[PDB]
Amino acid sequence: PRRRVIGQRKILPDPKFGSELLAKFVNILMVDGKKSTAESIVYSALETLAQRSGKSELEAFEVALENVRPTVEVKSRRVGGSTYQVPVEVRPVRRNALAMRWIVEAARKRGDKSMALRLANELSDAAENKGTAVKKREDVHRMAEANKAFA
Amino acid sequence: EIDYKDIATLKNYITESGKIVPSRITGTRAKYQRQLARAIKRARYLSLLPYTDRH
Amino acid sequence: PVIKVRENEPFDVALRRFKRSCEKAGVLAEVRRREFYEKPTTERKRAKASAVKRHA
Amino acid sequence: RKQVSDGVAHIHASFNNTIVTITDRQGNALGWATAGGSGFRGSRKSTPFAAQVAAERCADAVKEYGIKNLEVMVKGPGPGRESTIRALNAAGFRITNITDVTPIPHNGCRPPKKRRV
RNA sequence: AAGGCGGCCCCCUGGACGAAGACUGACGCUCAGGUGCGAAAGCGUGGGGAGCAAACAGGAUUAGAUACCCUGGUAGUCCACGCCGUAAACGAUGUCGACUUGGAGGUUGUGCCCUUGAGGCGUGGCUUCCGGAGCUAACGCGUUAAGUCGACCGCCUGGGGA
């Protein structure tokens, strides 16, 4: 918005871990204001994760997340007809948001049984970096380097 | 008084690159800037001043 | 618009002096200008337009 | 197969393209790169970035001749004067001279029509 | 005078202006018809032809694109000697003369001044921008008038048709 430069809202930290960055992940995963059942799915699929990649439950997230975190993206921009994809160096906070959001659009796409399976296997494969959330980060780092000309 | 042989004086009124300098800058009266530029244009014929800075 | 680097100088001072030697010569003004033929009627008009403006 | 020691970067900066050409001190060309060579068509051909790569792609092509120093001559208006004279430095040559050798007529030859666009 | 005139050098040549004096003694002003000069395009005869470029060709764009944009390209543009007699040939303001508050500049002369400084005090010519009285339908013009007068000439009398 034009005038209206603004603050932002304190989310509560996550009750089990005390992890403010993981609360944002249940919000992103939540549908229809059912935060309850988002938490069920997440807390589950970190048990299934942290067990099968040598422990640390905060830090099995933050290895898988660090892998998908971007560093540049495009930002399309008209000059007078043809339209210039400009690479632009992404903010600290928006790094995580895009990462988290891509993890979940990847997880929501697969064909395992539960969601807590689907999530656990697209946090496994992030940390050993294949599967669709890093195929997203790679096909964004193409676009930034393919259009590195324009900045 | 101003004179195509006097290539000491003519050097104050050309560039690095051997372009004549405008009265605007140098502060010179416009009668004499005519005489200057004519001096310089002869000098260049006789090879005492250069046209450019390629050589 | 000719330049050298004398000894114990950076690169970055020589590349600066190159540009302040070329804007002082007006190479690029004198090349923009001859991209396209301007009819003399247009040359005289733009000259007037500048002179009348710069009364400010 | 040879030594040269001292060369000459000729950068040719049109509006559509740059050609860098490294040559020895008496005109004889050793290597060259263009922007169009470096995987760039159209809009991106022009840019000061694809002038850079041109430089490199050429400083690469004269490892063989084992140049240390060069003079830079720059011929033209366009983007990639300033960029290309920096990407020959940072890819590991010494720069003795920088010259501007751009043809100015002393009113000479009638250019083409104004464009109506 | 207008059209116009732009590297440097020589030869032939026109006008303007200023200073102080001498000389003729109204020899002046305007001008229908008449004569000359008159951009660009265009025409004629003969040369030349780099670049540019009407026509023309191909490529794009587009509903179409006989165009704008791109790649080429012939007359033409250049020289000599003839014609053509026209332009928003415009300051859209005929020529000549006289008078009528100011300011800021530019250009080119010239005369007086511890030249003492690139300066101080005047006096001609051409020219740019403000603006007063007055004028004007208004916009504006405004000592270089579109103000106040005089002399001669040219021209207008609803729009189309034309």
Side-chain angles (χ1 to χ4, degrees):
Chain A
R2 301 179 176 290
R3 198 190 293 93
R4 199 162 131 285
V5 179
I6 39 167
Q8 57 176 47
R9 280 181 294 249
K10 276 209 172 79
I11 69 183
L12 295 174
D14 205 50
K16 194 167 186 178
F17 300 95
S19 178
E20 196 172 24
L21 190 135
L22 221 143
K24 254 266 157 5
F25 193 69
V26 300
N27 288 352
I28 286 147
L29 198 123
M30 158 167 51
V31 74
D32 310 321
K34 291 170 166 268
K35 205 215 276 297
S36 260
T37 99
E39 280 161 310
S40 300
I41 295 156
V42 154
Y43 288 137
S44 176
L46 295 187
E47 297 277 285
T48 313
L49 180 70
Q51 200 161 32
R52 311 303 175 76
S53 304
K55 312 315 294 166
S56 322
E57 207 149 322
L58 294 174
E59 306 175 299
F61 200 66
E62 203 255 305
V63 164
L65 208 64
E66 185 159 40
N67 242 295
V68 292
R69 268 203 271 286
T71 210
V72 287
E73 60 179 339
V74 287
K75 201 76 153 154
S76 89
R77 211 215 134 290
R78 193 189 202 73
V79 202
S82 306
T83 315
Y84 280 11
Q85 316 300 108
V86 184
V88 292
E89 234 98 320
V90 82
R91 303 127 49 74
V93 181
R94 191 170 162 76
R95 274 199 197 94
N96 292 291
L98 273 155
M100 288 194 254
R101 192 190 302 151
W102 286 334
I103 287 163
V104 178
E105 289 167 4
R108 199 64 232 139
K109 271 288 210 305
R110 299 156 69 86
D112 313 91
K113 296 296 179 67
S114 73
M115 184 64 185
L117 257 178
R118 287 165 169 198
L119 197 95
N121 300 318
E122 249 292 305
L123 284 146
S124 290
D125 286 312
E128 299 185 305
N129 58 352
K130 65 234 168 184
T132 319
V134 293
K135 190 171 125 65
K136 193 74 165 164
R137 197 213 63 256
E138 284 301 272
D139 282 46
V140 164
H141 284 157
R142 297 283 146 69
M143 240 116 65
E145 288 154 48
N147 299 121
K148 187 150 192 211
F150 290 128
Chain B
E1 65 182 328
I2 191 64
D3 182 36
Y4 74 93
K5 294 176 286 307
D6 190 19
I7 69 105
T9 302
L10 273 47
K11 279 168 153 49
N12 296 299
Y13 309 113
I14 58 172
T15 61
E16 189 210 90
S17 75
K19 295 184 83 188
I20 302 153
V21 183
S23 157
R24 188 190 290 99
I25 278 54
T26 75
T28 189
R29 297 286 149 282
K31 192 179 170 175
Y32 298 124
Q33 174 84 33
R34 283 197 300 289
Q35 299 186 47
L36 258 160
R38 202 163 33 246
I40 292 156
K41 280 155 144 199
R42 290 180 217 196
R44 294 157 153 180
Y45 185 56
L46 302 176
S47 221
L48 317 184
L49 297 169
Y51 291 110
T52 71
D53 67 334
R54 293 293 305 136
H55 305 108
Chain C
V2 183
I3 260 153
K4 75 195 82 178
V5 189
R6 301 175 307 283
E7 297 172 297
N8 291 300
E9 196 161 22
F11 175 63
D12 204 69
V13 175
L15 185 56
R16 189 149 287 186
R17 273 202 295 114
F18 182 55
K19 289 188 280 142
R20 272 187 299 94
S21 188
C22 288
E23 185 126 45
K24 192 133 192 199
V27 165
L28 299 140
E30 206 72 76
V31 161
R32 276 153 177 174
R33 188 143 86 74
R34 305 162 195 274
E35 208 161 89
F36 296 129
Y37 186 63
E38 197 168 29
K39 293 167 60 186
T41 189
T42 336
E43 291 178 308
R44 272 168 290 171
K45 183 170 66 138
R46 282 204 306 97
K48 270 189 266 278
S50 93
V52 175
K53 268 255 292 314
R54 102 162 52 78
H55 276 203
Chain D
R1 77 213 173 285
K2 263 180 81 186
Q3 193 62 28
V4 302
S5 203
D6 288 274
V8 183
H10 281 106
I11 89 81
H12 175 91
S14 19
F15 282 106
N16 303 330
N17 213 29
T18 64
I19 300 133
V20 192
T21 275
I22 305 305
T23 194
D24 82 321
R25 297 267 295 99
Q26 312 88 25
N28 302 261
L30 317 185
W32 58 266
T34 59
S38 322
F40 289 90
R41 306 309 307 167
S43 176
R44 315 209 278 101
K45 215 175 163 182
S46 69
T47 46
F49 180 76
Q52 249 159 225
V53 315
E56 309 152 67
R57 214 120 68 86
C58 195
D60 171 67
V62 296
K63 294 181 204 310
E64 303 303 273
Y65 296 71
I67 298 142
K68 302 213 293 297
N69 314 313
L70 30 76
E71 304 175 57
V72 191
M73 280 168 61
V74 168
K75 178 178 275 143
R81 303 153 56 86
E82 187 192 309
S83 115
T84 218
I85 305 196
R86 207 194 310 275
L88 292 162
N89 186 61
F93 297 129
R94 201 197 180 177
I95 307 293
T96 2
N97 280 69
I98 322 179
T99 347
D100 202 350
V101 299
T102 310
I104 308 310
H106 296 347
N107 262 43
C109 245
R110 171 142 176 166
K113 305 221 70 23
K114 281 271 155 77
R115 305 180 86 235
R116 294 194 292 280
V117 276

